[PDB]
């Protein structure tokens, strides 16, 4: 599964600065979804990849940003 990284408390996406390959997004995605996750910077937001199918990504059902 793929999707925008989301702050589980605020419902916000995670903003990044350098488009494309991005170690910030990579590490934040892994920190959230686990060591198998990938991630890169897309339109200045962190887009996570290789997520387990049940993973919760942006947007949060309950919480709007």
């Amino acid at each position, epitope marked *: 599964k793929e999707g925008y990284l989301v702050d589980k408390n*605020t419902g916000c996406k995670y*903003e990044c*600065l350098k488009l494309g390959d*991005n170690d*910030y997004c990579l590490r934040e995605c892994k920190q959230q979804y686990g060591k198998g996750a990938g991630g890169y910077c897309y339109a200045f*937001a962190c887009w996570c990849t290789h997520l387990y199918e049940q993973a919760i990504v942006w947007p949060l059902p309950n919480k709007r940003c």
Partner: antibody
Amino acid sequence: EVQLVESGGGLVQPGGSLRLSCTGSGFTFDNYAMHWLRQVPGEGLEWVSGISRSSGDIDYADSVKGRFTISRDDAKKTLSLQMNSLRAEDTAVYYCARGGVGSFDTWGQGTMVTVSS
Amino acid sequence: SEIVLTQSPATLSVSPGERATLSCRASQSVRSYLAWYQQKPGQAPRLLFSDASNRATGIPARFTGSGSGTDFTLTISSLEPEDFAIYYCQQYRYSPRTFGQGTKVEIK
């Protein structure tokens, strides 16, 4: 309400240095990417530099790379921009802005920076 | 080569109560990654829309953004006096992020 307040602007000669600071209030400062942009009076907008949450991702406009250094102090809720080797064309109002994930969703009132001999 | 945003017209002369239609054309597709700002005389920019159509908080209903790809518009359905300002578009599909040259909406 979400507010940003810039300081540290002023007049210097070419080759001089300034340190801009921005203090944020009314929001959780450490939860947002923060940016500096600038606007020559009477002219358009230009993004200058920006820094992600946790200072994990940092970038600069090509025209200021090697000369400007951005940093943040989350405890103090401050963003800083050390501007060295200032040039005439760096003259502008400098704005601090909160990142809106692509856009810039909140802007300070700006601080004037003049570089002139 | 960076994305060029062409805003037209450069100036738009209109009467209060009237409708204003501002155009932003991108040199190539920016999908929906386009923001609009208003800058009133003697003030800092103010975000109006992001993702082309998403209203920022406190922006009156009379403002709407639309479009995708290369052609975007900002529409003000019925101009209030405070609506007379400069308006900028800004893309964020690519780096460097770029702005249009602005459209001034002024009294007729």
